[PDB]
Amino acid sequence: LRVPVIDLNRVSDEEQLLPVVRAILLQHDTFLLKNYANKAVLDALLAGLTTKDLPDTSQGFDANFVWLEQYIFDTDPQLRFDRKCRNESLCSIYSRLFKLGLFFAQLCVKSVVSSAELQDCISTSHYATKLTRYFNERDYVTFLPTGVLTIFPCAKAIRYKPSTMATTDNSWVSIDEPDCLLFHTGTLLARWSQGMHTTSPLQIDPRANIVSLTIWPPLTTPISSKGEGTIANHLLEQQIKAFPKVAQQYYPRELSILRLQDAMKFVKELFTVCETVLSLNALSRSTGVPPELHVLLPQISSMMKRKIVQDDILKLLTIWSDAYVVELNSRGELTMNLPKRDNLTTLTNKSRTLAFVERAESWYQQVIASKRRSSSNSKTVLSSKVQT
Amino acid sequence: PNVSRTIARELKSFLLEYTDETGRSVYGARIRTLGEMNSESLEVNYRHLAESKAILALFLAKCPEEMLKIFDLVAMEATELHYPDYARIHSEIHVRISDFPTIYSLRELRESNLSSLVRVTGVVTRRTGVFPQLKYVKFNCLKCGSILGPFFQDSNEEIRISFCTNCKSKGPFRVNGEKTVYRNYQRVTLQEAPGTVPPGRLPRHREVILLALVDVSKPGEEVEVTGIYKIIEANSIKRREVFSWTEEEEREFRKISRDRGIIDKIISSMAPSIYGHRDIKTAVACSLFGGVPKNVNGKHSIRGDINVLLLGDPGTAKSQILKYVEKTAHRAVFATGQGASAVGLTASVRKDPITKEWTLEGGAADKGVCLIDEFDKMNDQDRTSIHEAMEQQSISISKAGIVTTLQARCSIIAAANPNGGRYNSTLPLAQNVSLTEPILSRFDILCVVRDLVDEEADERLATFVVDSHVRSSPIPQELLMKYIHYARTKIYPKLHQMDMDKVSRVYADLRRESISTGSFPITVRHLESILRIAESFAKMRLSEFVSSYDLDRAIKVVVDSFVDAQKVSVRRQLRRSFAIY
User: From which residue to which do the C4-type zinc fingers run (chain B)?
Assistant: First the structure.
């Protein structure tokens, strides 16, 4: 939970603060920048983000559906896409903070590989200012930043959702530093640096005013060697968009199912918790006992901390049928068991996980020939009905 | 066995490879935080190593005592190659096994759960700490004056030694613990919570051992402990935390709350045994549903609870309403007098006779509602402790070597009787009750009943009580008690400055009229009380904010409590409040 403070006039020395700033973004992620050349022009922008008059058109304040309002103002050079109200202070800060992004990129990549390779990373300067207004706060669900380098002013506004990077004790920490410019690094920048960067979320806080500046790499730049197939523009364009834009852009091939954005990753971790909780009870050297569904749902509820409906286990049965028997006991409770009597070995547990992920890959692979996941709702398996 | 040697090198390779989020090894940050702050507690989630190796999870679930001999050694080895000379200060470092999926109850503790890991919920009581307990003994034989020693754990009293080596005597033996083992104490008695116990049954209780985790637990709160079962030997404690709301019942609660003005239906559903009158149950329902606690920049904590006070002749029913809400409301604690229930509200240092020593305990529902019967019949300690808990929301313990200020944000429902039986309506309530004004000022609602001579009450009360004896429209009880827990844990209705300033106009009339005709005044606490009653009615209405007519019911609740708590000579105030009625 170390938060080193160093002047950014001393980084312009270039012989003493490159490793200190680099060591934090490889360990503590978000770095603390104080006393930038902007003084009273950063506090004069809080009266100009309250417009809220503009439509989306890859711009505009976007409220995902409600208290969360994200206003992104598309840069003027971009051809034939703009919405201009007034936004003079936003343009002046956009021109000034370009030097903060170029200088931060110069200090970041001069202790890694080369400081001459970032001039084509900032070349286009197409990044749009992101002005975030929260209504009078759970408005920010756990999420990751868009651009490679995000430098935002904030009052506090920042926590750390459960994840493992900065402050290795993995407790949620709220940090409030007066006179503070906080730098947020993106997911794609971690891929360019192959695992050096992470993310941090926003939490419930009294002050709803958040100004976030994310600087975007050009449309034509590939990312290392492996990203020659997926360019920074393609991956970041797939990442952000907007809810009206996701409705418009991702549209061409219908299916509001959207399971690719939704079910995949969450449903395939159900087997990992469920396989360990059926070896937690059924496997014991003491007094038998049959695995019941009433004591299984709360344990998986503890695993993900999320509410678990009893139908998710039925979806797990639909994808992998032969592991769990759905027979219902005479008392009304629905028991499940395993075919083996010699119990699940750790190697058999790993083989079951590989078989479950392979089966999910097979279902996703066969279902997507109709049109990336295409359309499935993860239909529940039919529960055997009691006779007569 | 040598099989632990292939286990050790497996998890030694595991701690250096766990990168779950963004390729970052969180164990290096965990080991630098325990090494820089000199901690001995290491945190490991069960899901992490369970996703890595299920055989280690099966070994931890089967034999955790031999599984714990590998964990501390590999943690000390990792701390030694990460930090030099760490063994000079700290010899051993324990681990904290958290995130147990199968949370058990106290009534499911059976013979099959022996020598295994178990996560149980409960409430802690009986705090005895930092004492040297025993595990070995020696004994001095006085006849020949000799020494002999066995073993003694944590359940029996002591293993009588009565046969010497060569004396062959039954002489008097003395306990030598001047060559003996180390001691660590945390004798805590844990109990089952009353908000999840089935009806008809009694909550069980066990004894827990705490070693290496003392005085970080708060007595009278819900707790989650993960330990081994043999007497439970706790490994990890959690002070953050079966009748709960589901997805199939949460949509119908909004559908029920949207139609047909459910506030009066909840009022009619409050008393099924008798007819009653809405003045007791309106205060009871707004006290159990409660308001919201708010602070401004970390300070100025307002009390979100509502403490109601019942008064009247002892022939009427005042204990049946609290007896119904003790079963109905969650975490409801019925306490009485000197100590009918052998548990109280006040901190105390006292002697204990089971082992015959001195101990300290801060008695007891931090989110719940405490019910006090016969409020006028108490001593100085339980009056001052409830006055401190009614004034601010904390109770301090400053004795037996411990100093702890615990949270006391509980609602208070008190019932009392006047001096002499009769209410004596030609005198105020301050001359009627033996209590004074600042203990009366904490109670915002003062409900009082009287005697009814007329045929109306004779036609209804006797017929309902004879209908109850001749037999051997509202909201049902189960949906109501599930709605209480659903609304009290999800919403927080605020207020908007659009037209709320009008209540500051009507308070400006209502304060002034209490000076010229009445003797007792109205203060800012009544304004805080009607805002809490209006937000409690908005909580019961399940709205986003408080409406404009919730304050009308709030001002009706404060007029029929304050005007009714005075003489008959404030009768003009019965018609003076008729313009806003």
Answer: 141-167
